[PDB]
Amino acid sequence: APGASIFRCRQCGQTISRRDWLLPMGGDHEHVVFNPAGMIFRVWCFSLAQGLRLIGAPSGEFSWFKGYDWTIALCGQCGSHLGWHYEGGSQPQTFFGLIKDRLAEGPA
Ligand SMILES: O=C1CC[C@H](Sc2ccccc2)C(=O)N1
Ligand SMILES: [Zn+2]
């Protein structure tokens, strides 16, 4: 009976990811970053996620991860901005960077 297995959208409960799917990019699953508007994000990298809606086409502009282009990832249910999908890179080609305080962790 693990209580810390699944990540859900904090705003609505949509199923998003799993602790088992955390990915240590450059040796750490956690990356703390700022956007050009100075907003700080505590980003957890995941190999896999579900329940999102990826908006638009990828952009390399101000990518926090060398070699990757990003797309905005909304909660597919409620539209909350949960993070970004990264693509176009190498080892791995793709991953998700999700904003940890916009998720809730809980049982399977
Ligand atoms: O890797 C990323 C994801 C998107 C954000 S936000 C951004 C806003 C305007 C232009 C370019 C990026 C960022 O800075 N870096
Ligand atoms: Zn949601």
Convert 52-67 to b/e letters by CB count within 10 Å (16 or more is b).
bebeeebeeeebbbee
Q: Which of 34, 39, 40, 63 to mutate to test the pocket of ligand 1 (most atoms within 8 A of CB)?
A: 63
Q: Determined by which method?
A: X-ray
State CA 53 to chain mean position distance: 12
For ligand 1, residues with CB inside 6 Å are: 35-36, 61-64, 70, 84
In the chain the domains, ranked by start, together with CATH numbers, are 4-108 (2.170.150.20)
Long-range CB pairs of 84-89, under 8 A, 24+ apart, other chains included: 85/49, 85/52, 85/54, 87/58, 88/58, 88/60, 89/65
State CA 21 to chain mean position distance: 11
